[PDB]
Write a protein that binds this ligand. Structure first.
Ligand SMILES: [Cl-]
Ligand SMILES: [Cl-]
Ligand SMILES: [Mg+2]
Ligand SMILES: [Mg+2]
Ligand SMILES: [Mg+2]
Ligand SMILES: [Mg+2]
Ligand SMILES: [Mg+2]
Ligand SMILES: [Mg+2]
Ligand SMILES: [Mg+2]
Ligand SMILES: [Mg+2]
Ligand SMILES: [Mg+2]
Ligand SMILES: [Mg+2]
Ligand SMILES: [Mg+2]
Ligand SMILES: [Mg+2]
Ligand SMILES: [Mg+2]
Ligand code: NA
Ligand code: NA
Ligand code: NA
Ligand code: NA
Ligand code: NA
Ligand code: NA
Ligand code: NA
Ligand code: NA
Ligand code: NA
Ligand code: NA
Ligand code: NA
Ligand SMILES: [Sr+2]
Ligand SMILES: [Sr+2]
Ligand SMILES: [Sr+2]
Ligand SMILES: [Sr+2]
Ligand SMILES: [Sr+2]
Ligand SMILES: [Sr+2]
Ligand SMILES: [Sr+2]
Ligand SMILES: [Sr+2]
Ligand SMILES: [Sr+2]
Ligand SMILES: [Sr+2]
Ligand SMILES: [Sr+2]
Ligand SMILES: [Sr+2]
Ligand SMILES: [Sr+2]
Ligand SMILES: [Sr+2]
Ligand SMILES: [Sr+2]
Ligand SMILES: [Sr+2]
Ligand SMILES: [Sr+2]
Ligand SMILES: [Sr+2]
Ligand SMILES: [Sr+2]
Ligand SMILES: [Sr+2]
Ligand SMILES: [Sr+2]
Ligand SMILES: [Sr+2]
Ligand SMILES: [Sr+2]
Ligand SMILES: [Sr+2]
Ligand SMILES: [Sr+2]
Ligand SMILES: [Sr+2]
Ligand SMILES: [Sr+2]
Ligand SMILES: [Sr+2]
Ligand SMILES: [Sr+2]
Lengths: 56, 81, 46, 143, 82
RNA sequence: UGUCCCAACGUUGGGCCCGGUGAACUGUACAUUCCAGUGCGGAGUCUGGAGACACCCAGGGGGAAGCGAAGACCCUAUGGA
RNA sequence: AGGGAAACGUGAUUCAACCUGGGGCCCAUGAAAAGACGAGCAUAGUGUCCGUACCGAGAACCGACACAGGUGUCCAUGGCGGCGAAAGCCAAGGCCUGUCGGGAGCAACCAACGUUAGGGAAUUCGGCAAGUUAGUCCCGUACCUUCGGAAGAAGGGAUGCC
RNA sequence: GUCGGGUGAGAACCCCGACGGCCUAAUGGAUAAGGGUUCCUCAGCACUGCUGAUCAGCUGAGGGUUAGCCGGUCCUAAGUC
RNA sequence: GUGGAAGUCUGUUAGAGUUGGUGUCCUACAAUACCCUCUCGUGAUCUAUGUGUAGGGGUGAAAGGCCCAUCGAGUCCGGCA
RNA sequence: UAUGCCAGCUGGUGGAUUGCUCGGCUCAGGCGCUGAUGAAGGACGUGCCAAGCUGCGAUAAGCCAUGGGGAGCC
């Protein structure tokens, strides 16, 4: 069984969903953690300086 | 403060329920319960509500099918608005 | 699947948005729903 | 005219598969105006819409074969496909036989014909596979 | 109006599983020619259809007696079995 | 026992002609070539001859050191893992 | 009551479901909790909230596609057949959308495939490819063996219909 | 698939009948996930559809999902916070 | 004779797999497909859903295999021009 | 003279060029905290007809008062 097309058919699991806090479809319904805003992980909002060029 | 009755839901299927089963249909606030719909309807058109069925529609609203008692005539009620 | 009340509200909103720009808006602006979606060609969120 | 919706209502009102409903070729116009199920029932009573009969496979040729075989024919080596034990379950056969031999021995005993002592001796022999059949058992009892 | 016998031996040129079809064509071409009319004007009565398809799509009769009538302003033909 | 001697005939789908639909690869330029030679020694394009009226259809692929991929081999780099 | 145009059966066999027992196995031991029973009867009232369409696939899902791929469950008792949930044929039911057609006895060439005289592996690295054999019953069965097996060894015969 | 016919400005492929076929653990019936209105009706054919199209999963406009006793909801499992 | 054991045999039962054709395909139906042949099919079996293990770390009946078409060290953005 | 070569003409295709600027970019000065009295952000609503943006919040492109403003406005 190939890793390509044939294995794409088994994908019918729901993981990332609309997030209650930020509105993005990044709330992982299995981990109960938003990969976009950190909801479920931290009270503070997920943020990182590498999300932009260093001197900006 | 949100009100219970939004407006009469008027469609072919609604008219039938009104002519054949003495039922009135309304678009109502989706936070309303069957009981709150019965009470609201009785106090707006002065009638007796026997049963209320509900459905959260694909229009984001709640539809209620209110059956009046045999003393009240759906057709006549609906016709005065 | 099984939709929750909220999911259903969001789906309904998406259905509503998925409509034509009223004809009068054309005249008034003297001459496109850029968000027109198709159930098959597109994929909604959640 | 396009009558496929009417075909679906008809199959439901006549309670049959759509493939079995028949629409009179000369009434496409009237059937075409049929909107409601009542419009369909109406046309049905008029005979404009009818349900074609369903088929059942004839079992005649089968029955004749069933008779030859019940009579012992058409079962020569050339007609067998399954292994012997598959044509007759051996354990099943033994159950049939041994039960028949025990019912026999039990009747002879209540009927006083066998002392519980001769009965015991024959019972243990049957259970030990001494007799091929009932007749074989009787032949043995007759010394 | 007259009775004619159509030879369908040329259906053998078409693949075996579709001879019935080719036959129905040969019939129309034969009548069109012998009755001096356009093929589009030749009308084949279902009786002829059922005759050619009798043994399925692969087994056509080698010939077929056909009764055909000719008439009208534009010129047409109407045919059926016998 | 058609693997072979040694191939034949037949079947179905294509192929071919017609209606409709309708891409891609590839393209420095010129280009009807062939035989020799020459040239960075492996030329349709240079030299000498030979041949060569234009266009189109079908074909199997000799050549364009054919197209596809900045050689996985080899070496080199005060390269990487 | 309902349903059927009508009749609106009666017995039997084999018996999925479901019920209840007996036996055997483990250097393997085959969940838990809420709840229920234990603990009667009448009448009345209450029983809110969320889901409910449709597809479920050679066009509704994932694979950029109306993709020959991938994708769980139950229908496992429809008829003949036969050991069979096998093949083949046929019902109930579904379909002509594994969706471009028209024409040429329709050439070469290619993909699948049928039939080939005599020779019979000479072909090839190699029997690759194809073929040969075949189901069931009876007879019969070597070396070797860890005594289980080898074994369907091999070899021989039979096979329908009435 | 074929012969007739229906509708339409227009019909090989939209519909009716007949004849001829295909599917039998599936090409039938009910569904899980997932999709999200694709479901039904009317009116359409510029777009989408391996050709055409009067058809449609396409376009326009409306409509459609009703529960004490079917799921959720309650319990706890590996395990998570 | 009974009994009915077996990482037991035959078997396109369901289901799992893939020896050969170095067949078809190779701008594909498909960025791993199609057909025939072949292997397993009561168990160290197959399978659905849930759940756990995370990047010099997992997982591995060990092939440097697998960890979302990529693995002798994933992916994303940043260091970074 | 067909197939055809080079250049131009008329008409297309295409959107270069020239002109234009509701947007950018950089500099300078000023100013500078918000939130449990629930912020920032998001969701879903809200219009006669209303999909998008903007506004607003079941009092929903808006309600009240004071001053400005003015014969138009939505
Ligand atoms: Cl027992
Ligand atoms: Cl449910
Ligand atoms: Mg409900
Ligand atoms: Mg709509
Ligand atoms: Mg036994
Ligand atoms: Mg045929
Ligand atoms: Mg290089
Ligand atoms: Mg090397
Ligand atoms: Mg190094
Ligand atoms: Mg298709
Ligand atoms: Mg020969
Ligand atoms: Mg040799
Ligand atoms: Mg071989
Ligand atoms: Mg229509
Ligand atoms: Mg699992
Ligand atoms: Na409303
Ligand atoms: Na979608
Ligand atoms: Na051959
Ligand atoms: Na060549
Ligand atoms: Na059977
Ligand atoms: Na078609
Ligand atoms: Na024994
Ligand atoms: Na294989
Ligand atoms: Na790493
Ligand atoms: Na400031
Ligand atoms: Na708007
Ligand atoms: Sr494997
Ligand atoms: Sr596959
Ligand atoms: Sr899955
Ligand atoms: Sr946490
Ligand atoms: Sr941060
Ligand atoms: Sr609606
Ligand atoms: Sr898709
Ligand atoms: Sr020259
Ligand atoms: Sr060629
Ligand atoms: Sr029994
Ligand atoms: Sr349903
Ligand atoms: Sr289904
Ligand atoms: Sr499939
Ligand atoms: Sr049938
Ligand atoms: Sr089509
Ligand atoms: Sr022959
Ligand atoms: Sr040899
Ligand atoms: Sr040799
Ligand atoms: Sr033999
Ligand atoms: Sr047109
Ligand atoms: Sr439809
Ligand atoms: Sr086994
Ligand atoms: Sr190989
Ligand atoms: Sr082969
Ligand atoms: Sr390949
Ligand atoms: Sr096996
Ligand atoms: Sr078994
Ligand atoms: Sr990978
Ligand atoms: Sr960088």
């Amino acid at each position: 069984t190939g890793a390509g097309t044939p294995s794409q058919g088994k994908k019918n699991t729901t993981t990332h969903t609309k997030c209650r806090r930020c509105g993005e479809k990044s709330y992982h319904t299995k981990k109960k953690v938003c990969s976009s805003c950190g909801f479920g992980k931290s009270a503070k909002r997920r943020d990182y300086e590498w999300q932009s060029k260093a001197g900006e | 403060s949100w009100d219970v009755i939004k407006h009469p839901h008027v469609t072919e299927k609604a008219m039938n329920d009104m002519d054949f089963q003495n039922k009135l249909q309304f678009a109502v606030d989706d936070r309303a319960s069957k009981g709150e719909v019965a009470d609201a309807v009785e106090e707006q058109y002065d009638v007796t509500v026997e049963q209320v069925n509900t459905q959260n529609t694909m229009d984001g609203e709640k539809k209620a099918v209110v059956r009046l008692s045999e003393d009240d005539d759906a057709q006549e009620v609906a016709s005065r608005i | 699947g099984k939709k929750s009340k909220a999911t259903k509200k969001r789906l309904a909103k998406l259905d509503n948005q998925n409509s034509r720009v009223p004809a009068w808006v054309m005249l008034k602006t003297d001459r496109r729903n850029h968000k027109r979606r198709h159930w098959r060609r597109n994929d909604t969120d959640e | 005219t396009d009558l496929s919706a009417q075909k679906r209502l008809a199959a439901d009102v006549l309670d049959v598969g759509k493939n079995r409903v028949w629409f009179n070729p000369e009434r496409q116009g009237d059937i075409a105006d049929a909107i409601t199920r009542e419009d369909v029932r109406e046309l049905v009573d008029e005979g404009a819409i009818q349900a074609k009969d369903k088929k059942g496979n004839s079992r005649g040729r089968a029955r004749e074969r069933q008779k030859k075989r019940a009579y012992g024919h058409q079962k020569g080596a050339g007609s067998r496909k399954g292994k012997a034990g598959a044509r007759q379950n051996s354990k099943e056969d033994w159950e049939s036989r041994i039960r028949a031999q025990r019912t026999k021995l039990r009747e002879l005993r209540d009927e006083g014909t066998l002392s519980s002592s001769q009965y015991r001796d024959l019972y243990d022999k049957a259970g030990g596979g001494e007799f091929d059949s009932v007749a074989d058992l009787e032949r043995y009892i007759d010394a | 109006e007259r009775v004619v016998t159509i030879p369908l031996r040329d259906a053998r040129a078409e693949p075996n599983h579709k001879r019935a079809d080719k036959a129905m064509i040969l019939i129309r071409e034969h009548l069109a020619k012998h009755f001096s009319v356009d093929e589009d004007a030749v009308r084949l009565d279902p009786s002829i259809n059922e005759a050619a398809w009798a043994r399925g799509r692969a087994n056509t009769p080698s010939k077929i007696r056909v009764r055909a009538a000719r008439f009208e302003e534009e010129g047409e033909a109407i045919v059926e079995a016998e």
